[PDB]
């Protein structure tokens, strides 16, 4: 079968070079144009670069033309994509497509993600979101926890080491104006349930190598 | 470098019914567009090449059309498994470049958000900085607005949100939004609530907390 893998991806600072590679096979890789396309974090695909089948022909999108130069090594069926002064906007993921006479995109790999800032890697700290009144409507009550400024992604969730899975919702990241990311992961139990379970959402964050497990306990603020 | 616009951004069909995508060219391009599917946290799929031809594989429900400019594709009878983003790209000159694309969600009838709001953790505020969290859980549709007003004063700036994607089991969305001030500024102020309106809610609703209460 086709099989197109790209690597390479990773963080960056701005300003810097990084080199992307996509690995073919299952196929005369000889005979087909092969491309790179991007896809910024929640956005759309946007074309990056062509090579012909023989390497002597390379075309690129007006927004990395100049900075980015695309290449084949036809005798180990690689494609490369070098890419210098990256900047912000370049923060994507990268897929290797083969085309068809420069056609169509037929096949595409699994793609890469480069992230480029000036980030520290960091381990976030994760605060709860403790049910309570405020949080419990009828018998179901709402309980999580914030997964406050790590970098850079990504961060694994999991409630009470995977036994809790129904009614979890964790929500995508979303960058902060501080470069660093944020996420909450929530759950909904029944309110029966809190005085006699301890909830605890498990946290992992590989590129720091940061594990946290917060208890998520039940909270009140009446008077009564 | 010829322009790709795509309508509608976004479109909810009934399974069984059909979706209609249409794509246009800035310029002309023959018969050299192509359709992609493209799925959360996959690889795009080619559909439809040279703007009619089903790529193999590619179920018969699938139907792409049009030459020039204006270009179509229709998904009759859509199956769950149809959600998903489209996108066209053009061939016909390089640059090569495609359109914004057009997500595409399972309709179902519309659901309100139960919504609950959590004040900053002791835990938090005491490293200097206070976060509250909104959350609205399985509605249905996905358009759901979400203002903060701190002493009733409406905030702008300090807050973001998260949406997840359609949920397989019974098609709604949740969404989270973070209001986060500094534990000097959040001790200034009284009251927080969110005030949430969307489809499922004759008038909108709102969640309030006094500081110092849960």
């Known amino acids: 079968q086709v099989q197109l893998v790209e690597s390479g991806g990773g963080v960056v600072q701005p300003g810097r070079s990084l080199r992307l590679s996509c690995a073919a096979s299952?196929?005369?890789?000889?005979?087909?144009?092969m491309n790179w396309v991007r896809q910024a974090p929640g956005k759309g695909l946007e074309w990056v670069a062509i090579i012909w089948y023989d390497g002597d022909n390379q075309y690129y999108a007006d927004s990395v033309k100049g900075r980015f130069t695309i290449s084949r090594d036809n005798s180990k069926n690689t494609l490369y994509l070098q890419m210098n002064g990256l900047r912000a906007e370049d923060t994507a993921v990268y897929y290797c497509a083969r085309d068809l006479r420069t056609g169509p995109f037929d096949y595409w790999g699994q793609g890469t993600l480069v992230t480029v800032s000036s980030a520290s890697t960091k381990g976030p700290s994760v605060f709860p979101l403790a049910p309570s009144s405020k949080s419990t409507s009828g018998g179901t009550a709402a309980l999580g926890c914030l997964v406050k400024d790590y970098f850079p992604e990504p961060v694994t969730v999991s409630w009470n080491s995977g036994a809790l899975t129904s009614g979890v919702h964790t929500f995508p990241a979303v960058l902060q104006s501080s470069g660093l990311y944020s996420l909450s992961s929530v759950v909904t139990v029944p309110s029966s349930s809190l005085g006699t379970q301890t909830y605890i959402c498990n946290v992992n964050h590989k590129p720091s190598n940061t594990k946290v497990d917060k208890r998520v306990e039940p909270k009140s603020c009446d008077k009564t | 470098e010829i322009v790709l616009t795509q309508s509608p951004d976004f479109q909810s069909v009934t399974p069984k019914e059909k979706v209609t995508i249409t794509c246009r060219a800035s310029?002309?391009?023959?018969?050299?567009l192509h359709w992609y599917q493209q799925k959360p946290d996959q690889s795009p799929k080619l559909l439809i090449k040279?703007?009619?031809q089903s790529f193999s594989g590619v179920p018969s429900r699938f139907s792409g059309s049009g030459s020039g400019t204006d270009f179509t594709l229709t998904i009759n009878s859509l199956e769950a498994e149809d959600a998903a983003a489209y996108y066209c790209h053009q061939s016909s000159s390089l640059p090569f470049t495609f359109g914004p694309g057009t997500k595409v969600d399972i309709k179902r009838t519309v659901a309100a958000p139960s919504v609950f709001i959590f004040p900053p953790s002791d835990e938090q505020l005491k490293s200097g900085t206070a976060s509250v969290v909104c959350l609205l859980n399985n509605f249905y549709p996905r358009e759901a607005k979400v203002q903060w007003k701190v002493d009733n004063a409406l905030q702008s700036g300090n807050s973001q949100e998260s949406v997840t994607e359609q949920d397989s089991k019974d098609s709604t969305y949740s969404l989270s939004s973070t209001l986060t001030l500094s534990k000097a500024d959040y001790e200034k102020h009284k009251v927080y609530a969110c005030e949430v309106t969307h489809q499922g809610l004759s008038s909108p609703v709102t969640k309030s907390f006094n500081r110092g209460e849960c």
């Open positions: 040279y703007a009619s």
């Open positions: 310029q002309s391009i023959g018969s050299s």
């Open positions: 299952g196929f005369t890789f000889s005979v087909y144009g």
